[PDB]
JSON list of C-alpha atoms in Angstrom, two decimals:
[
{"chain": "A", "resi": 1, "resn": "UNK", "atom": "CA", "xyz": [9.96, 18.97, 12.29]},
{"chain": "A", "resi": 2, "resn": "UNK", "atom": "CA", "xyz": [7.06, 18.22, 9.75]},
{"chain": "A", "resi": 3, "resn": "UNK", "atom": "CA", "xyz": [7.72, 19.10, 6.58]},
{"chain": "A", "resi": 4, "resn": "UNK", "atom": "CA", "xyz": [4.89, 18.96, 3.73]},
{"chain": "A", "resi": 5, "resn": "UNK", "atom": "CA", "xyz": [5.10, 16.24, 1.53]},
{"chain": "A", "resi": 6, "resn": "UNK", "atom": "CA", "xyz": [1.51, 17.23, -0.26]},
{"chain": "A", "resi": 7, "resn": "UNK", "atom": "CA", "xyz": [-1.44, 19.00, 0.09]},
{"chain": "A", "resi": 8, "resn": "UNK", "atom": "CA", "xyz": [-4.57, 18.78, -1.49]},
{"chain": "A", "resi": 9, "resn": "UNK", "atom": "CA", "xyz": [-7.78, 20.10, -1.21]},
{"chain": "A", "resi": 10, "resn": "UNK", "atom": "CA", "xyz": [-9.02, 16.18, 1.03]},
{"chain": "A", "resi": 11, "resn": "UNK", "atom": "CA", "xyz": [-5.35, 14.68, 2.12]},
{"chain": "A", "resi": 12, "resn": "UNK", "atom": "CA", "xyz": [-2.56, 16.29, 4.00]},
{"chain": "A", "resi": 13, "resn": "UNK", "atom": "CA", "xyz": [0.73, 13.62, 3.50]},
{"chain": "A", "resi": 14, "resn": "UNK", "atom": "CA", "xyz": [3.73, 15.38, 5.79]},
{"chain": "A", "resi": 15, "resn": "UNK", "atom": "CA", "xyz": [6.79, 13.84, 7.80]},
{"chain": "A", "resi": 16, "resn": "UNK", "atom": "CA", "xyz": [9.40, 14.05, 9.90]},
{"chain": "A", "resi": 17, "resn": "UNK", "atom": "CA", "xyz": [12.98, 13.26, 9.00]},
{"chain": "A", "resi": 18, "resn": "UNK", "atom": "CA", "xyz": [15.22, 12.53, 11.10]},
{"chain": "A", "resi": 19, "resn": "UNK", "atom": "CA", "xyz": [19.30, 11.37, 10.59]},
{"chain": "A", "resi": 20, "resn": "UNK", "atom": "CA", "xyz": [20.07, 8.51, 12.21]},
{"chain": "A", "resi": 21, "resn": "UNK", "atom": "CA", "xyz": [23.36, 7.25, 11.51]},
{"chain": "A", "resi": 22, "resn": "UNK", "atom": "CA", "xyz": [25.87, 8.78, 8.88]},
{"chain": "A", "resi": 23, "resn": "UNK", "atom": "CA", "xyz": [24.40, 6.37, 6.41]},
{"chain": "A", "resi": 24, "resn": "UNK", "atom": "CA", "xyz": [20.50, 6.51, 7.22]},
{"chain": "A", "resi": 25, "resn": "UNK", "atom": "CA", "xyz": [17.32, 8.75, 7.27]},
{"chain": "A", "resi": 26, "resn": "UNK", "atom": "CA", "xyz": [14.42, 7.88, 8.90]},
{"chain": "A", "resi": 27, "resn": "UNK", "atom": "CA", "xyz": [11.22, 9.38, 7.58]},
{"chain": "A", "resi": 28, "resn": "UNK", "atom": "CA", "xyz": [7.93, 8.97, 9.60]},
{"chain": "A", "resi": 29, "resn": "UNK", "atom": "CA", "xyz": [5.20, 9.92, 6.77]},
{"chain": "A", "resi": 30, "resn": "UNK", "atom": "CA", "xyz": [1.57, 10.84, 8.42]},
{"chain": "A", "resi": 31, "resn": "UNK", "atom": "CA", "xyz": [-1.54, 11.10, 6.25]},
{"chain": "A", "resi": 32, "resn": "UNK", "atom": "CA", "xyz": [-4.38, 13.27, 7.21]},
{"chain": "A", "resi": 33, "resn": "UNK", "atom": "CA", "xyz": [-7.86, 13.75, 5.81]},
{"chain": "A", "resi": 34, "resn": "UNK", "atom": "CA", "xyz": [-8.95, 17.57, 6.00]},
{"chain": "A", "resi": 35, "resn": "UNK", "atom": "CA", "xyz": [-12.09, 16.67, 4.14]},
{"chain": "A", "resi": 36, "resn": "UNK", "atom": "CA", "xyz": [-15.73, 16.53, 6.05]},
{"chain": "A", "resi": 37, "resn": "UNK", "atom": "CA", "xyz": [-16.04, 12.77, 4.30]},
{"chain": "A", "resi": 38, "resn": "UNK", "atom": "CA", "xyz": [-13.85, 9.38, 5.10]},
{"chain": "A", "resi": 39, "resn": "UNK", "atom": "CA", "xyz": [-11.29, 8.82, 3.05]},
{"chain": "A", "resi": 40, "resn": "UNK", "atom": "CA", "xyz": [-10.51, 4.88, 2.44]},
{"chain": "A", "resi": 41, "resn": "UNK", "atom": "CA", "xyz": [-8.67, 2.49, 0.59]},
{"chain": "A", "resi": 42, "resn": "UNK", "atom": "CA", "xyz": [-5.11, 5.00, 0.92]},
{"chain": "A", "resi": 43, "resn": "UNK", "atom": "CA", "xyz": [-1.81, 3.83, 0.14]},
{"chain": "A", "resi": 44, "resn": "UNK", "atom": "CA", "xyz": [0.93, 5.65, -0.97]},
{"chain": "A", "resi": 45, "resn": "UNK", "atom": "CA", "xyz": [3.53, 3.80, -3.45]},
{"chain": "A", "resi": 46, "resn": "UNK", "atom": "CA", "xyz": [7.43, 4.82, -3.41]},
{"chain": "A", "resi": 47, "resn": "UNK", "atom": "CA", "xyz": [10.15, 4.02, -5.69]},
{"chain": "A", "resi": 48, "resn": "UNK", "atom": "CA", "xyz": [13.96, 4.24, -4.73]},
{"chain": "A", "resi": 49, "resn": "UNK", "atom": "CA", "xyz": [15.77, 7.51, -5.01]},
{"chain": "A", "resi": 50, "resn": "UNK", "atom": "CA", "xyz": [18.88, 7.03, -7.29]},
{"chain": "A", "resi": 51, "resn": "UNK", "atom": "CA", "xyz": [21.82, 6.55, -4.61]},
{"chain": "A", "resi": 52, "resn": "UNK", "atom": "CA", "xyz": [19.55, 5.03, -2.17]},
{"chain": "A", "resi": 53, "resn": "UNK", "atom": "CA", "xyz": [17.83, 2.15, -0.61]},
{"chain": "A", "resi": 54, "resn": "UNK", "atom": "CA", "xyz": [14.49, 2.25, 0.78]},
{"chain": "A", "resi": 55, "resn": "UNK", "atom": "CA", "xyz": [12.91, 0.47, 3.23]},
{"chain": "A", "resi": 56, "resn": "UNK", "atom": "CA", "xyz": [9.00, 0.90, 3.44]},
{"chain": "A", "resi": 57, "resn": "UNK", "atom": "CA", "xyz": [7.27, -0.25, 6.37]},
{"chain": "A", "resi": 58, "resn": "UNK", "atom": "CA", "xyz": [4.10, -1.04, 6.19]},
{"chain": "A", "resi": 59, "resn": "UNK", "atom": "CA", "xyz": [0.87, 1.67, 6.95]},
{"chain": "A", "resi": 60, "resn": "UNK", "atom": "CA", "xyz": [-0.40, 1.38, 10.45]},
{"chain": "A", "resi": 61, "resn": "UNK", "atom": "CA", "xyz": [-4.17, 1.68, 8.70]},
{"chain": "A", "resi": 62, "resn": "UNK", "atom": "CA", "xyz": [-5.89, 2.20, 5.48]},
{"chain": "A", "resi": 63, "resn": "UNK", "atom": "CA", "xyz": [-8.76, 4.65, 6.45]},
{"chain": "A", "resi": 64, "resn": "UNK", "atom": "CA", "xyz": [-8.88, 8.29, 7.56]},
{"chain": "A", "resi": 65, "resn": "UNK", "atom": "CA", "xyz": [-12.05, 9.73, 9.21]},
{"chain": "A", "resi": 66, "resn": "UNK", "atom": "CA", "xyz": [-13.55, 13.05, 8.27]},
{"chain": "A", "resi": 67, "resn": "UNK", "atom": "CA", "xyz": [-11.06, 16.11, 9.60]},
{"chain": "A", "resi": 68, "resn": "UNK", "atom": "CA", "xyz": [-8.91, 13.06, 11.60]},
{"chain": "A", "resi": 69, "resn": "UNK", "atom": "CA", "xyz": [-5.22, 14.58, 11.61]},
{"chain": "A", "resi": 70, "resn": "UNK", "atom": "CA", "xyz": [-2.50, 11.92, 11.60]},
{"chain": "A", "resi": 71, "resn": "UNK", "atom": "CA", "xyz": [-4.71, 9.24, 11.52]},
{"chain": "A", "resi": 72, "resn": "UNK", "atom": "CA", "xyz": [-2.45, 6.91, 9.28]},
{"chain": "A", "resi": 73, "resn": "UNK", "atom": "CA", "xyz": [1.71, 6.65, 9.86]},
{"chain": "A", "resi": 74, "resn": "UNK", "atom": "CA", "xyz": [4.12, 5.43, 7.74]},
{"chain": "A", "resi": 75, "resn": "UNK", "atom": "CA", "xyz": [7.54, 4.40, 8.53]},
{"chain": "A", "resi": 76, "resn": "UNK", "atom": "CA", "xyz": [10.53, 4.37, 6.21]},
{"chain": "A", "resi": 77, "resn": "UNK", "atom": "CA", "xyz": [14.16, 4.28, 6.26]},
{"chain": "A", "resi": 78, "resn": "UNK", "atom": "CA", "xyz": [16.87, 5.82, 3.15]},
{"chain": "A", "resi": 79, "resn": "UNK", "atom": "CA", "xyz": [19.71, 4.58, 3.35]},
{"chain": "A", "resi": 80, "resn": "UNK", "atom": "CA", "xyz": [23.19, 4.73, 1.18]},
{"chain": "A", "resi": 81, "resn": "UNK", "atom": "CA", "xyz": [25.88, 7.01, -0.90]},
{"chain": "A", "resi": 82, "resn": "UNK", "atom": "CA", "xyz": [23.19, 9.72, -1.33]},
{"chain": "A", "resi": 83, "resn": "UNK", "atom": "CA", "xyz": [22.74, 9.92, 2.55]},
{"chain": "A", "resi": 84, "resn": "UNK", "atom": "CA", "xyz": [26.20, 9.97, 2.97]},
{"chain": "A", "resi": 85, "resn": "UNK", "atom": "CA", "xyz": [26.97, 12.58, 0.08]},
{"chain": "A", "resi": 86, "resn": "UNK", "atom": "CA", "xyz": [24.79, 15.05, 1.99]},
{"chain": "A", "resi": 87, "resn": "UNK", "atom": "CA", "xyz": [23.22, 15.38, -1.91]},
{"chain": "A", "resi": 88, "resn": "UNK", "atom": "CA", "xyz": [19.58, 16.58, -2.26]},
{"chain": "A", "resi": 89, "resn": "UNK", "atom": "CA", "xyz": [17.57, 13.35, -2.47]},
{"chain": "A", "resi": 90, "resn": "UNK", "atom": "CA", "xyz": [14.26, 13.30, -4.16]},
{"chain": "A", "resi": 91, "resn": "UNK", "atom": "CA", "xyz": [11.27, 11.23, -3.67]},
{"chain": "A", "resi": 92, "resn": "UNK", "atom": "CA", "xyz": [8.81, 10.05, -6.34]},
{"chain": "A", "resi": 93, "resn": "UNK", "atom": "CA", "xyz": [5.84, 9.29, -4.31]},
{"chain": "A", "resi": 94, "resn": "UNK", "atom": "CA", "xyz": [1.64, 7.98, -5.84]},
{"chain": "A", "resi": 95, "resn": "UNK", "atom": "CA", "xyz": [-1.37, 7.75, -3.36]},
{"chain": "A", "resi": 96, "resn": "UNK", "atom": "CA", "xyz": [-4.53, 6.49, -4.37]},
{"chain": "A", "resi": 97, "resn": "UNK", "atom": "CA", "xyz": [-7.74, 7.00, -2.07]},
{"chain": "A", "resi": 98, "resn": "UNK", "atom": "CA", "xyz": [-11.68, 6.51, -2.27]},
{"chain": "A", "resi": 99, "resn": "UNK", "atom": "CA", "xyz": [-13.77, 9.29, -0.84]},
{"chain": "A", "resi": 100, "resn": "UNK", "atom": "CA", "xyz": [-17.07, 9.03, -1.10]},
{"chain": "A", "resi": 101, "resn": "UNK", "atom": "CA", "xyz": [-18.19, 9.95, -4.76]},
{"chain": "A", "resi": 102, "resn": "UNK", "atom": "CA", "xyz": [-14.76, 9.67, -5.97]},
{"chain": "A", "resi": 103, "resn": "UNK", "atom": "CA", "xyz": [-11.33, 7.35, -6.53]},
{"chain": "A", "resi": 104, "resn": "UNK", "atom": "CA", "xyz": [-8.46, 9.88, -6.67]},
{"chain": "A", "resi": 105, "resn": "UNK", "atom": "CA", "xyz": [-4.64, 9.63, -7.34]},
{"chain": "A", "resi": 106, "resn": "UNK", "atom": "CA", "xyz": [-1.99, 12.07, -6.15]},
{"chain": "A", "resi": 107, "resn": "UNK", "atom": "CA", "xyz": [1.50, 11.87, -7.38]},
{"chain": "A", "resi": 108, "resn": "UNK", "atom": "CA", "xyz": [4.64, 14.05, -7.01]},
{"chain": "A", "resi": 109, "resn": "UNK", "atom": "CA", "xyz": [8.82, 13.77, -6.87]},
{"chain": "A", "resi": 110, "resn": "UNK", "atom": "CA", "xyz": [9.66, 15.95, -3.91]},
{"chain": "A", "resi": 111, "resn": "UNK", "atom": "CA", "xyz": [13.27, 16.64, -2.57]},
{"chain": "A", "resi": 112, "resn": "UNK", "atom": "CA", "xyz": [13.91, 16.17, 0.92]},
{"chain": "A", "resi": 113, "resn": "UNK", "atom": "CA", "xyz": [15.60, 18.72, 3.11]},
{"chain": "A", "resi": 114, "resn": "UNK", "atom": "CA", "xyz": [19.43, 18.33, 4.57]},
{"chain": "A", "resi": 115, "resn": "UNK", "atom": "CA", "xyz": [20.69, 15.38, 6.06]}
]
């Protein structure tokens, strides 16, 4: 069911991904902080994968307590040929968080399991 987007050594990002229609994923993304400080300002920026559309809901929250799992979710839908093609679909993702002390970035391109 979850699936690890990212982990660091302050910020778990991992989702489920679900197939909803022959044409459509829908991937709920949860952020947690496994730090012992808050972790504030998050948001996580997505671009389109290349056969795809994606539709990025907006972040229930923008803060994560101190060792708070699932504290933020994230709802997005893919959608098109790629879906369809049952292709490997890959997802170039950028966060950017304060903690206290610090303003950090965390950026990857992961592929996403099988339709």
């Amino acid at each position: 069911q979850r699936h690890i987007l990212n982990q660091s050594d302050h910020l778990r990002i991992d989702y489920e991904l679900t197939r909803e229609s022959m044409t459509k994923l829908r991937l709920v993304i949860f952020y947690s902080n496994i730090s012992s400080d808050p972790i504030t300002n998050f948001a996580l920026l997505v671009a389109s994968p290349k056969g795809t559309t994606l539709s990025l809901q907006p972040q229930s929250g923008n803060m994560l307590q101190s060792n708070s799992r699932d504290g933020i979710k994230q709802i997005a839908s893919v959608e098109g040929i790629s879906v369809n093609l049952g292709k490997p679909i890959k997802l170039k993702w950028k966060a950017n968080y304060c903690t206290k002390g610090d303003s950090k970035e965390e950026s990857g391109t992961t592929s996403l399991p099988t339709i």
